[PDB]
Design a protein around this motif. Sequence first.
Motif, PDB file in Angstrom:
ATOM      1  N   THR A   1      -3.205  -5.760  -3.338  1.00 19.91           N
ATOM      2  CA  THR A   1      -3.799  -6.905  -2.605  1.00 19.91           C
ATOM      3  C   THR A   1      -3.728  -6.909  -1.049  1.00 19.91           C
ATOM      4  O   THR A   1      -2.871  -6.276  -0.390  1.00 19.91           O
ATOM      5  CB  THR A   1      -3.274  -8.268  -3.100  1.00 19.91           C
TER       6      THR A   1
ATOM      7  N   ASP B   1      -4.846   0.919   6.208  1.00 21.46           N
ATOM      8  CA  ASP B   1      -5.690  -0.187   6.617  1.00 21.46           C
ATOM      9  C   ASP B   1      -5.314  -1.479   5.842  1.00 21.46           C
ATOM     10  O   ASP B   1      -5.487  -1.545   4.591  1.00 21.46           O
ATOM     11  CB  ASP B   1      -7.153   0.235   6.411  1.00 21.46           C
TER      12      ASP B   1
ATOM     13  N   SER C   1       0.832  -1.195   0.000  1.00 21.16           N
ATOM     14  CA  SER C   1       0.000   0.000   0.000  1.00 21.16           C
ATOM     15  C   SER C   1       0.856   1.229   0.000  1.00 21.16           C
ATOM     16  O   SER C   1       0.674   2.093  -0.874  1.00 21.16           O
ATOM     17  CB  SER C   1      -0.937  -0.061   1.169  1.00 21.16           C
TER      18      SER C   1
HETATM   19 MG   LIG Z   1      -2.033  -2.920   2.331  1.00 19.70          MG
END
Ligand SMILES: [Mg+2]
Length: 164
Positions: free
Chosen positions: A58, A33, A17
């Motif tokens: 993912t 998150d 992320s």
């Molecule tokens: Mg992530």
Amino acid sequence: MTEYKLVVVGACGVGKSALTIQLIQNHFVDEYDPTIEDSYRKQVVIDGETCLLDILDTAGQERDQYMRTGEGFLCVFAINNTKSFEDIHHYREQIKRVKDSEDVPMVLVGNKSDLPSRTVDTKQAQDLARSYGIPFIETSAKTRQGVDDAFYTLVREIRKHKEK
Ligand SMILES: [Mg+2]
Ligand SMILES: C=Cc1cc2c(N3CCC4(CC3)CN(C(=O)CC)C4)nc(OC3CCN(C)CC3)nc2c(OCC)c1-c1c(C)ccc2[nH]ncc12
Ligand SMILES: Nc1nc2c(ncn2[C@@H]2O[C@H](COP(=O)(O)OP(=O)(O)O)[C@@H](O)[C@H]2O)c(=O)[nH]1
């Protein structure tokens, strides 16, 4: 405008992320998150070609449909998480399975290079990527070292495999 389907894979906590956020938004996030899986967009001119990157970040459970239409895979481990590196063989085996190919566009990513005292050395990563026939890129979603290289290299690996 040319679309590229990218899939970012790897263990929880490696920085999938954070790396995506750095691509989209040019800043380093502290938390994000771990339960959010979505596909994001980024339009860049790469080598004179207006591209629309479709980047699937993912998460979720420990599916073939999504993965089967991935054109390139970013396989991410963290350089301070030996298990995440050892896991890469599993992710590569499983990606090959679903593409039924020995030649799948793939980039190995070693993230968190800004962290002291790595437990996976660059030689271990470079050996693994050499054995796979794929580029290796060290990243830091914190500095932003390598983030562009990782994604642009994957786009180029896709072009190498197929006409776009
Ligand atoms: Mg992530
Ligand atoms: C991406 C799909 C995927 C994930 C995991 C997985 N994930 C856990 C990590 C996150 C997502 C997925 C990222 N997350 C976060 O960021 C939140 C913290 C959670 N874990 C394991 O197995 C583990 C690791 C290796 N160990 C030796 C045994 C058990 N396998 C996985 C797997 O292959 C299934 C065989 C696949 C997979 C592949 C590649 C290809 C086709 C497929 N079709 N269906 C699943 C699947
Ligand atoms: N120092 C450092 N921390 C990072 C880096 N990339 C991610 N992190 C941190 O690692 C933690 C997990 O990252 P996240 O991006 O959720 O990982 P994910 O589970 O792969 O999506 C977060 O607290 C991030 O801030 C990096 O390159 N350097």
